[PDB]
Design a protein around this ligand. Sequence first.
Ligand SMILES: *Cc1c(COP(=O)(O)O)cnc(C)c1O
Ligand SMILES: *Cc1c(COP(=O)(O)O)cnc(C)c1O
Lengths: 405, 415
Amino acid sequence: RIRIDLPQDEIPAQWYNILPDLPEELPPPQKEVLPSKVLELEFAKERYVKIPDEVLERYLQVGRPTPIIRAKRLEEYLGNNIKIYLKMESYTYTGSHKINSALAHVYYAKLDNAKFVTTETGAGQWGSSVALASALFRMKAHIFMVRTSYYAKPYRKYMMQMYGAEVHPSPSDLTSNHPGSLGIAISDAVEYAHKNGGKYVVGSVVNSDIMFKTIAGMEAKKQMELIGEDPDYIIGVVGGGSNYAALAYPFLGDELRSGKVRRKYIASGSSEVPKMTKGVYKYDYPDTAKLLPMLKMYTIGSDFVPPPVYAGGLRYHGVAPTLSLLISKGIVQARDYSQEESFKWAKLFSELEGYIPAPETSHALPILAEIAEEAKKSGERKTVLVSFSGHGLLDLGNYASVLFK
Amino acid sequence: RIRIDLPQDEIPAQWYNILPDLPEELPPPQKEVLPSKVLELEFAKERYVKIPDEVLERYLQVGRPTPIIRAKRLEEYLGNNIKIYLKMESYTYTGSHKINSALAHVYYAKLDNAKFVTTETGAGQWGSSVALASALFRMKAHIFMVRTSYYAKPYRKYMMQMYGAEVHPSPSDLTEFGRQLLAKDSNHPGSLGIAISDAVEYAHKNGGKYVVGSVVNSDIMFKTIAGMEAKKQMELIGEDPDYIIGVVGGGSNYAALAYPFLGDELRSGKVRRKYIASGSSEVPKMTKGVYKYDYPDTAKLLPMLKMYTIGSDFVPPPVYAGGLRYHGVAPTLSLLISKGIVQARDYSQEESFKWAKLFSELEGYIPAPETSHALPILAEIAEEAKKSGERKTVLVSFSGHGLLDLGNYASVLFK
Ligand SMILES: *Cc1c(COP(=O)(O)O)cnc(C)c1O
Ligand SMILES: *Cc1c(COP(=O)(O)O)cnc(C)c1O
């Protein structure tokens, strides 16, 4: 009884849409390449949206529902002051939550009779997720991978290729050895989709994309209800915020409706990319390519470039608009930790629990230490539910660059 | 309804020992450093050996029981002539079945009050599994890794290090055997036999125990937790497999799945299911091995075993990347093959990796290169099943995922 399995025939059948439940309307922003039904869901007004049959089928295909695991050996290390439950989005075939939305974007593109889909990727997480979704929907995928990552971090490129996708170093020939960047790769992929009748699958922080990922939180609420455990804290890490919102919003939405928020919601980023603790809540460009409307979000600037030493994976400059609203209203609390502190926790967690977290995920572990410290003072036990967003088996080089000389 | 989970509170509590049920008497084999219980269990005569409670607990800790997944999209591709169930040993935290043995070996080392464990490793699959097992028992681990692999295949080294193991390039300066070889070449490339000799000496001289990753009977027995689980999972959905298939490195993953089923039939007096196992035609011990006593490890130490072998000095061509490099077949499995009870196949790495890619696109999960050699068997079964007029059920030992072996695939498939 470490693992809480949800049977596949009990998988939730709807996504959760937080918009009708937000304290106040979201600041408004300030269509040829996007799947049509995706743009439409960005304004959805109903609280629950049915997961299409074909999408749910492939959720089951890629390993959903994912388990919750109780991290009892970590609990002991922390003095048994808190109980720790991990929602294991790492258990999907691509090793993260990203496939939860990649599958939906590809489904809706297929419904627009897309000839192929395109997308950008840096280190390869989003690209490999889109490559898997495309294979399962029998769709041709053209992935534009920053040339530096295309050569430095080749394994996820090989993964995309095993799934049948064509991986193009950005900038490429279709379009001397310009190392590229993520913003060029977005333009590099958005153009190829525009001039060849493809659709662009957006790897950014829109509302529809959080909604698709909320299958994780819908499952977790069922699983926690299955063992009779109501979490006092829900925590996670913020690249753009989609993985954390996906877990928390199904729980938080019911609190917002009932009037009172009882649970504590805490999210972390990297202090080398400190949008969570040093970012400013204002309109900014959600992608470094500067196309896509501006939205009001916590941000350290779409032009921010992480230090070369940074290997923690939370490189994005901003926070999803709904999550930013929640933070500015005091509903979600913010933290930031260094990669040395986080990767030290990742190593400890690997030895204690046996499972190597993604470097991104490791930034949630210092939160647990803080909650345990407050519990020791209070001194009342608390239950924490963690978005365990990925595993680290394709990121061991990141860990090595910091931990192993 | 494609995944069959076995709840953790339903995990089997004993390992299966085929020795009392083998048809013929199996060739008897031909040690301050081995755990005492490991030596004892080689010759065990009971059918079932109780899994110690501390080992069971860590089975749960590393992801057991693993799921069976039905590969419906692959069934469709193949004409819906067969049902295909995959026992997913890839779902353990180290990505393969080797942890099922490593945990037992480390526990019995702890029971002997060992100060630490040692083992050898090449590509890193065994080293990673011992490193995790050791972490979960708070056992210090010293892993002696073939020096060339130490630098060439570093990701699995990093995995060992994340688990807190100390990784020593081999030959190392920590032993006399290693220091002597470094005196001739300060950067000696090492070998698996050299790494074995390193680990054994270090254990012997410093109060540790050596954890063996080879085809001894106890090792297969420890891995039978996967077959015990799979038998319960298949019975739970009313599916009796007609074929049980897998790949052969030394044969432990396949035996671990098959033996719990095969024992029942050996006891009934007649084998009705079909058992098919495959290797690499570049390392063709399965189809072209000589059946004789041979060294189970490449620089001796362990006693000789009677097995299908192509010689412990066999080295595969440098283009080979299928991962089934080992030169022999476990002795009990060798016996079964020689009696016609298990059928042998071998496939090229081009044919197997072609199937790996197809399977990755159809089902969305990247097999280990080693595992991919089971896939060609399915096309043979689909043909046979069509002739029967019934839809036949196949159970597959899905021994690992390929995420740490994607370079291997790229060398064959992507230029
Ligand atoms: C990309 C990534 C993240 C951050 O993404 P979000 O936009 O915050 O959801 C977190 N964990 C893993 C494993 C990732 O790959
Ligand atoms: C080592 C390995 C094998 C070979 O296993 P044997 O027990 O020796 O037959 C097969 N598959 C994977 C994934 C392996 O790592």
